[PDB]
Design a binder for this molecule. Structure first.
Ligand SMILES: [Mg+2]
Ligand SMILES: [Zn+2]
Ligand SMILES: [Zn+2]
Ligand SMILES: [Zn+2]
Lengths: 86, 77, 49, 43, 875
């Protein structure tokens, strides 16, 4: 119980889990930079759809993206989460 | 005049020790005046003898957790 | 068994052929430089608060 | 002075004491003593 | 280098700044000469700005696109008061000495006041405001400057902008010159202590000596087809100010009556004040040609059509459409039907890569007139190409490479925003996937109507096409329809079954339904089901399937549910698994063994239902799959079974009518006994009400009980399996009051809780006797809609329902106030609720940090539901 037990449960729950806003941000950034000329990190030969957003979704589902989320807590502590093969 | 701390609408108020208040403000990453305020002339603030610069620990009744803890900062007025 | 009958029906002058309007691009205001208004002009829907 | 001016000045003094304590320029006991002094002097 | 705006610093515009930024000086009051060219030095000087497409600006070598407007200045010989700063000039005047310019407070206290204010100005702004107010209050009522002791005179303000001293003569008026000269004496420290920034807002700058001239870019001339140019009101005022500036200057250098000078000084000041703001209290509005009040600087900023709420908070946007809506049960809940015309006009810009080059080439081969095609091609350097003016579109397709941008038509699977107004909650606008269909209407699934509050009475909805990759990705990730099945207001589904869905589910899931292989194949042909049906429930004498058996094909093989059905309101309720009426639902290991499906199992806005538990425990994708497959079976089975409403469903036999007549006679006898007791003075009142007011209550009670009893009789002598009863008990449409009124009697009609009384003297209608208060005379209807109403019964019924015809600004205002109060709150990684300015609101959100959208109907966990999940198959 740092401040309250509920806050500790909250921070323990979100320790190794991505929020929907982080997923949306990662997918949008990957799609934007993939439409600008980047090379896909997956096969992209037998995918159902060949648009950038679908490829970004598939690249996020199987961890190949070298992207890191930086969480800044209000007291200044920093947490880093990697989506590259977790 | 009259004792009101026993009313069913009034939660429990407690003055917080300086070390505990210091730890709280450090672990929240704030200044003391960024908490919700309570006046020194508040009817329940006077009942416990609270002076400005203190932090009051308030325990309210909740339908989700049973008991809930809240903190207020004593101001002048 | 289904009920069959004969009922008098009326056609109202509210017809979808006069109610649909779309805008991709077009003219803008001289003052605010924002899209115009009305189906008579090219149009533009208001995105309110 | 006036009640409002006294309230403003005591609020300012509490703010200064808290700022100095949070910067580790004071100990807990010194902060307690200064808080008590201000509260008694402005009661 | 590209920067961003991180702040705005406000202040008063210094006359040195006004002159320094100016490009010219406006001296001439003539706007246009004979030929039409603008006079250099007038309001329409081309040096101010360019509004013509082909003209070029002299100040900057730029056309209308690249030229920002340029400012001029009007030189004032006599200073004037800015009407927007009168409340500040008044405070500066009342709290300062007029000889040395001091706050009129002893410097010993002044120094400590300044020290305290400097110490607290940034940490406690409210305390600083209170301190400044206290200083002003104690400095106004001094009457003698401590530095002078010169008997300070009180100053009074006469609206709008008239300052009046009170000297020994008791009457003397202050000119703006003396006011400004007095305000120049105040030092910077005294201004700072009073709550004003001295280096950016100097008090005498509120007295105007130079007037800026707005650029022509914000002062356009409207081109009307009538052939006459119409100027905006700002020029129509500036000409008046410059006229009065010329009109008054010649008087000073030629004579000095000193009475016509001040009668013109009070007219130029009025013109300036009205140019800054019209609709000044206690001041006449200004017209130009037709007695229409002018629109000035402050009128362009306020109102619902002004700058702020008309162009800054909201605006008109591109790539949007509006059309009537119509149903479509063949769409998914994620889809919207789009006309071919709209798909070919709105476009999505797609950048060409090495993975999508062939599809984009095929789009380019088709022109702007064939779907799916394209309207424009953008080259890598940034030139657009209209594909309808291209000589050969087959060669242009072969020449595109990675880096090109093609604006192509909408295709199936595109993401758009679909909205219905008013937008009360956030699911009033959701993301949908495009499907192009023949027609000129927006097609919408029937299960998607409750979130939009939509209907097919002639309603219209809006469409929006996101244009950038990031916007489309956000819309697809956060706003998709099936992700928002559960509403955030309470833990319940806002998407679910309607009217034919409920009755079709009831008719299919009832235990008497038997099906053959061909009928089962017909029912399952509308779904995605392919596989083994298993053995029929009945093998001999004939092979028959059951409706419950067919429904069970779509439930998960570990789902358990026990609960009552909606049809269990009446005597068929047994409150246990042993029920011969199919009133209790039993599901074990995904097998529907008992009960029926109705509003309490699949209906929308029913929390803690079977559908809600399925969605909660298997995901919203499972809910999307279930709503798209099983809800079609209900419609198909209604098509096979046949569902109609005839006129014998609401017709009762003669014995029921006789019983109702006897009951009506008994009720009338009771009312007559009440009336006789009232007439003989033997009627006791009810506390707080007079007699003849208690008698009305007794009569109303008796008539209500009569209606209830008659409805019970009519229900008793009607078939409990006709289609109206099925629609009522299952929860599709109708209630028991509707059946009672259609089959037994309407009952008593009322207006604002009282019987029908307003009419002639001591009688409502001329058909009745004087002083008659019998039930029929005051609005009791004893016929039903099936049998028909009497003329006066029809009049009474029309009178009773008048006040429902009258049946929003207050709700909108309250919601707007709430939105502006709460818009800055956020959930932090700490779990704390904080404002964007850092203030803490809640230490932990709610009490357990549980989102109401993920709640089990306000509960974080339902433990009984968990127990049923684990051991429900053997309980
Ligand atoms: Mg409607
Ligand atoms: Zn220019
Ligand atoms: Zn003086
Ligand atoms: Zn039963």
């Amino acid at each position: 119980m740092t401040i309250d037990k509920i806050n500790e449960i909250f921070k323990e729950n979100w320790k190794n889990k991505l929020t929907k806003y982080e997923i949306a941000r990662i997918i949008s950034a990957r799609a934007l930079q993939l439409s600008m000329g980047a090379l896909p990190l997956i096969d992209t030969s037998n995918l159902k759809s060949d648009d950038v957003i679908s490829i970004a979704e598939e690249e996020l589902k199987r961890g190949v993206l070298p992207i890191t989320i930086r969480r800044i807590y209000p007291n200044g502590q920093v947490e880093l989460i990697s989506v590259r093969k977790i | 005049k009259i004792d009101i701390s026993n009313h069913e609408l009034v939660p429990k108020h407690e003055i917080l020790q300086l070390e505990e208040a210091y730890k709280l403000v450090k672990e929240l990453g704030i200044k003391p005046e960024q908490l919700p305020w309570i006046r020194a002339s508040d009817p329940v603030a006077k009942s416990i003898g609270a002076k400005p610069g203190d932090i009051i620990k308030i325990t309210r009744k909740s339908p989700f957790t049973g008991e809930s803890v809240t903190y207020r900062y004593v101001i002048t007025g | 068994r289904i009920l069959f009958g004969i009922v008098y029906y009326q056609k109202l002058h509210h017809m979808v052929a006069d109610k649909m309007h779309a805008r991709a691009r077009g003219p803008v205001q001289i003052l605010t430089r924002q899209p115009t208004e009305g189906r008579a002009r090219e149009g533009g829907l208001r995105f309110g608060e | 002075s006036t009640v409002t001016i006294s309230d403003i000045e005591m609020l300012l003094k509490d703010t200064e004491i808290w700022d100095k304590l949070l910067r580790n320029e004071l100990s807990i006991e010194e902060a307690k003593k200064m808080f008590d002094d201000v509260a008694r002097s402005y009661s | 280098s590209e920067k961003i705006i991180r702040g705005v610093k406000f202040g008063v515009l210094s006359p040195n700044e006004i002159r320094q930024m100016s490009v010219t000086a406006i001296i001439t009051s003539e706007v246009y000469d004979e030929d039409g060219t603008p006079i250099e030095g007038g309001v329409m000087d081309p040096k101010l700005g360019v509004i013509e497409p082909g003209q070029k600006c002299p100040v900057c070598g730029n056309t209308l696109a690249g030229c920002p407007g340029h400012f001029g200045h009007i030189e004032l010989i006599k200073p004037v008061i800015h009407i927007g700063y009168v409340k500040h000039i008044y405070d500066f005047l009342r709290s300062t000495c007029w000889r040395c310019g001091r706050i009129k407070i002893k410097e010993q206290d002044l120094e400590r006041y300044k020290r305290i204010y400097n110490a607290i100005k940034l940490r406690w702004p409210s305390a600083a405001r209170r301190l400044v107010e206290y200083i002003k209050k104690i400095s106004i009522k001094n009457l003698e400057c401590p530095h002078c002791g010169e008997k300070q005179f009180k100053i009074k303000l006469e609206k709008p902008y008239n300052f009046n001293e009170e000297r020994n003569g008791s009457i003397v008026k202050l000119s703006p010159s003396e006011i400004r000269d007095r305000l120049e004496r105040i030092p910077d420290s005294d201004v700072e202590l009073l709550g004003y920034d001295p280096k950016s807002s100097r008090p005498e700058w509120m007295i105007l000596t130079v007037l800026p001239v707005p650029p022509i870019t914000i002062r356009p001339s409207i081109t009307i087809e009538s052939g006459i140019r119409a100027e905006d009101d700002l020029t129509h005022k500036l000409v008046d100010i410059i006229r009065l500036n010329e009109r008054l200057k010649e008087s000073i250098e030629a004579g000095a009556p000193q009475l016509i000078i001040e009668d013109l000084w009070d007219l130029l000041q009025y013109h300036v004040a009205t140019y800054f703001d019209n609709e000044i209290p206690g001041l006449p509005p200004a017209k130009h040609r037709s007695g229409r009040p002018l629109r000035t600087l402050a009128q362009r900023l306020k109102g619902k059509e002004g700058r702020f709420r008309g162009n800054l908070s909201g605006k008109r946007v591109d790539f949007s459409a509006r059309t009537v809506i119509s149903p479509d049960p063949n769409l998914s809940i994620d889809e919207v039907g789009i006309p071919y015309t709209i798909a070919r006009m709105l476009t999505v810009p797609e950048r060409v890569t090495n993975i999508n080059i062939e599809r984009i080439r095929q789009y380019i081969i088709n022109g702007p007139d064939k779907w799916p095609g394209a309207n424009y091609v953008i080259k890598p350097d940034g030139r657009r190409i209209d594909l309808r003016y291209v000589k050969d579109r087959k060669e242009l397709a072969s020449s595109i490479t990675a880096g090109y941008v093609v604006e192509r038509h909408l295709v199936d699977g595109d993401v758009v925003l679909f909205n219905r107004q008013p937008s009360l909650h956030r699911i009033s606008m959701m993301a949908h996937k495009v499907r192009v269909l023949p027609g000129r209407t927006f097609r919408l699934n029937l299960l998607d109507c409750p979130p939009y509050n939509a209907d097919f009475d002639g309603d219209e909805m809006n469409l929006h096409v996101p244009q950038s990759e990031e916007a489309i990705a956000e819309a697809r990730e956060l706003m998709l329809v099936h992700k928002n099945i559960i509403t955030p207001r309470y833990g319940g589904p806002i998407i679910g079954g309607g009217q034919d869905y409920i009755s079709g589910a009831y008719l299919l899931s009832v235990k008497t339904t038997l099906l053959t292989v061909e009928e089962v194949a017909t029912i399952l042909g509308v779904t995605d089901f392919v596989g083994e049906l298993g053995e029929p429930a009945i093998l001999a004498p004939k092979p028959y399937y059951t409706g419950k058996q067919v429904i069970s094909l779509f439930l998960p093989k570990d789902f358990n549910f026990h609960g009552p059905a909606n049809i269990s309101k009446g005597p068929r309720a047994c409150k246990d698994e042993i029920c011969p009426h199919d009133s209790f639902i039993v599901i074990k290991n995904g097998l529907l063994l008992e009960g029926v499906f109705d509003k309490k199992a699949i209906g929308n806005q029913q929390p803690e239902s079977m559908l809600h538990w399925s969605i909660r425990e298997y995901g919203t994708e499972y809910g999307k799959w279930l709503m798209d497959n099983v809800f079609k079976m209900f419609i198909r089975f209604l098509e096979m079974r046949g569902f109609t409403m005839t006129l014998e469903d609401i017709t009762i036999p003669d014995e029921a009518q006789n019983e109702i007549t006897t009951k009506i006679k008994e009720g009338y006898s009771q009312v007559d006994e009440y009336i006789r007791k009232f007439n003989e003075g033997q009627l006791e009142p009810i506390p707080g009400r007079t007699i003849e007011e208690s008698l009305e209550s007794y009569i109303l009670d008796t008539l209500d009980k009569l209606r209830k009893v008659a409805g019970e009789i009519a229900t008793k002598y009607l078939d409990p399996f006709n289609n109206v009863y099925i629609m009522a008990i299952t929860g599709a449409r109708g209630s028991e009051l509707n059946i009672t009124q259609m089959t037994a009697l309407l009952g008593q009609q009322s207006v604002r809780g009282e019987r029908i009384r307003r009419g002639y003297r001591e009688r409502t209608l001329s058909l009745f006797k004087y002083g008659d208060i019998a039930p029929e005379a005051r609005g009791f209807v004893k016929n039903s809609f099936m049998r028909g109403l009497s003329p006066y019964e029809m009049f009474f019924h029309a009178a009773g329902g008048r006040e429902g015809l009258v049946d929003t600004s207050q709700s909108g205002y309250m919601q707007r106030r709430l939105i502006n109060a709460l818009s800055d709150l956020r959930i932090e990684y700490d779990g704390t609720v904080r404002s964007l300015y850092g203030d803490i609101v809640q230490v932990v959100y709610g009490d357990d940090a549980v989102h109401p959208m993920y709640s089990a109907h306000s509960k974080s966990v339902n433990v009984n539901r968990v127990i049923e999940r684990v051991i429900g198959w053997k309980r």
